[PDB]
Amino acid sequence: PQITLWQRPLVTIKIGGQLKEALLDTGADDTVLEEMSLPGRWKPKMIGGIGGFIKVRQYDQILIEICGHKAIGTVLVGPTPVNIIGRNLLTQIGCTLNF
Amino acid sequence: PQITLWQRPLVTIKIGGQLKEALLDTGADDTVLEEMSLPGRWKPKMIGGIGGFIKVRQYDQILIEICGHKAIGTVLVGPTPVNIIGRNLLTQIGCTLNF
């Protein structure tokens, strides 16, 4: 589909059996979601944004579904103000910027 | 043009007669650039991101070129980690997300 930017580009994602609202963020290297449980191993990571850095948990090879499009990749979990879908997953669903 | 997201969507912008590199950011509501001088008066603004909030100076009706596309709008200046082109200007150049 084609999503305009008149409003924040929020979409529904399915992950870990839960449905959540997330922001398609072309300026985000990674994907980070608010506190939640995920299966498998994880390792700590520090990520920076405007405002400074926060500590998150990194889970690899996680299945996710964005607008019906399936993909797999690394998902970060931590004290983020909003759920963010980063480029690591946007590429997998074939998302591009056009103008 | 169509921009894929395998790499950061960094483009060249022109403001105050100078060229700078900036990140096309669909997750950012506003546009914030690293410290620089701009004309006119400014108003205070707090912008929140992943690590919290930062104080910035808000300049309105500023001329800025993005990938050759001319725009005139609000530009924030402050201690941002990278120059960010937000939706306020992405909408002016007619940018959309597609997949």
Ligand SMILES: COC(=O)N[C@H](C(=O)NN(CCC[C@@](O)(Cc1ccccc1)C(=O)N[C@H]1c2ccccc2C[C@H]1O)Cc1ccc(Br)cc1)C(C)(C)C
């Ligand atoms: C590895 O680094 C990364 O990729 N980090 C990402 C990141 O922060 N990228 N920055 C883009 C900004 C991302 C963001 O859209 C997220 C966001 C959206 C909506 C609500 C809250 C937060 C945001 O902060 N938006 C705010 C904003 C920005 C400008 C003007 C007005 C506003 C209001 C908000 O919309 C750029 C960057 C920062 C630090 C570093 Br070292 C490098 C690059 C990550 C993975 C942490 C999300």
